[PDB]
């Protein structure tokens, strides 16, 4: 058994993470697809994504990272797999997610399981984390220490 | 007595069509109004989107098919009819769709309908379906023949 | 053309009347199909909803009143329709709406369309204009007249 | 890997068969744990809910069916399992099923998995299918063959 | 400038009492009001719901406990308030709340301001505390330490 | 006492000037936080909307209008204060707005409440009003005079 779990990933967030276990705890296998967007975005570049990932991650031996492009369930069952695991926290765009899950289904055949991030995590988002710590706001709490050391040397 | 479905339809989907269709059932003439977003493009021109519109609606002797200008209202009424209707489908900003109701309401005097699309075709909207084309993967059940036949054309 | 207006009105708000006028402004005939349910404890008798509706609708013509027992799309096909129309407000349960619209399409080829209620009327619902009613404030502006008569009647 | 599937069933509908076949596909084993309720009694009793669930999954060699009491998180944990799947519909109280996920994670460190039932079962459920089958309503495609035999006996 | 945070509490939660500690922070008075509706039954009569309220708010000089006795603004008008403060929750009936704020304000000039309750206390509501200690599992973290106490004299 | 009322106010509308009185009504002060973005383009230069904002509030003694810059919380922190409060209308995005209550709670322990805009108002925003307006719409009895008379001027 085996789930993907996407996303672009910049930074991973304690949620992601949080998702991850989840996924590895249930799964025999558990990749996490970084999908970078076409705009000349973001913060941090590909390496940087993927360490980020791998440092926060060395407690989950069955999950690897992988950069993904295309359709998210071209590259799932890439690695053999038929299933997405995707965390669901407050200002989720849920019904969004919901059309692309049917999509997804309808296409390739893939499901698509959504799990609700532990309330602590359940505010911070790749984006709000990274406005709020460039102003000077603590977000520590809520990104893993690889992520808040990258985040202070961005600072300046 | 007579209802307005306007939109981009870049391009028309089967949930357009179901609408229409609900639309064209329930009102004794229907008109679909093209509205080109000055913002975009899109990705077929207006004449195309009149054509697929066209085609895809022989079988509604009471629908017919008209570029809009300006304040959706004013065209509506310019139409002589005081009804919108539009579909609803998984994704739909509904929250936003009830406010520009409330303010269609309270400008011009239209009332909008809203229909649940058929579930079928309650993932497809003209976005995804064509991320997805553009991406490689199939849609063509759930858009319908004038467009699939313009969109295989239209990505060689 | 033909649209129903289901219903316990338990008893008619100014809420419904807003979408019964909009309702008669927009299709041929409507009938408002008062719903006995065996047997949610209702305040007022059935006769008494017949006479409330009756009399707060005196000034729409194409518009009338029928009892419905069973489904509501048996009610509908009797009346030679094929549309209900609903009113959304504030505290509406949309969601369970929506399930019944897809079985109601699906076991009947019936549409089900929404309209948002003018705002002013936006809150009153027969439930809450019941239970502030029976507590002595006033909901008055909310009903119409031939409710309001039929209120401070009970309230004794 | 082990999931647990738990409910009422009463009775199982499609829209549940498609999440037991999703479950199924994704985890090693699966338990569709019937859970009843101190209440009214249902339409069927434990014998008719586990036999139809069963006659409905014969085609999943690694679900079984199981009467559960108490706390959804007791049982899960009784079977050597630490995940529920569980379906979403429209329109299901998803706000209420997030607040469980959240307290059955706190409690017993259960996580829950929400996946879309396919589009053409999106709009069954229990209480729905029961409704409009007794009232002559057509539901027998959104009901596995052994349940609609049964509520054919029950329309006696 | 005062505050009524109204409510049946039965019991008190810690997802309560964040709410009056927000609401004591932000107006310099605070009522807290019980209102045990007829159906009032029940695992708490109104002398322990006072009880555990009063002992669980020590630390709030500015707010006071009173039963509450008919319609909700009522009481409020007779604490010479106009304001409401109302906690959400994972789960919360956020539509109709808004109903009945708007219905508030209309009848009796009372605003009613929303704010989301603490992530760790976001889950817990009366109705499920009390399920779940009955079924066995552990919600004391979710419960302010006068009503854990006088929870296990029930469990005995 | 004291809140914040924050927003672009590009420009302020009724639906703003009614959470204002409200919270004046409640709050000891309430400062009105004008807040750059270095972004979304925007209509009014920022002396306008201040202009604007003051011209629509000389009725509220106990209110002032000021320019932030950077995190809401430390703009309210700033004044003194540990209170936000905003406005929900039809077509908030109340799920973003309460990923950011969380967020700003945690970084500051700044309290959001949230109040419904009147229902008359409960449609108006600054971009749909921009919107309607500049294509000829009246949208007149939505916002203050002060902005009617610059949106005239625009309007060539």
Redesign the interface.
């Given at each position: 058994?085996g789930?993907v779990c996407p996303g672009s990933f910049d930074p991973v967030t304690l949620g992601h993470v949080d998702i991850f276990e989840?996924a590895a705890?249930?799964?025999?296998e558990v990749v996490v697809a970084i999908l970078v967007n076409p705009a000349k975005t973001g913060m941090f570049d590909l390496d940087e994504r993927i360490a980020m990932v791998k440092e926060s991650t060395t407690h989950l031996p069955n999950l690897r990272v992988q950069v993904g492009h295309?359709?998210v369930?071209?590259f799932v069952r890439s690695c053999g797999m038929?299933?997405i695991?995707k965390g669901?926290?407050?200002?989720?765009?849920f019904?969004?997610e919901?059309?692309?899950?049917?999509?997804n289904?309808?296409?390739?055949g893939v499901?698509?399981?959504?799990?609700?991030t532990?309330?602590?995590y359940?505010?911070?988002?790749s984006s709000?984390a990274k406005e709020?710590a460039m102003?000077?706001?603590?977000?520590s709490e809520?990104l893993p220490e690889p992520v808040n050391r990258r985040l202070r040397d961005r600072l300046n």
């Open positions: 058994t789930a989840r705890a249930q799964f025999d295309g359709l369930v071209d038929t299933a695991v669901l926290r407050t200002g989720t765009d019904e969004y919901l059309q692309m899950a049917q999509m289904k309808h296409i390739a499901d698509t399981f959504f799990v609700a532990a309330p602590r359940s505010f911070v988002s709000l709020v102003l000077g706001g603590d977000v809520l």
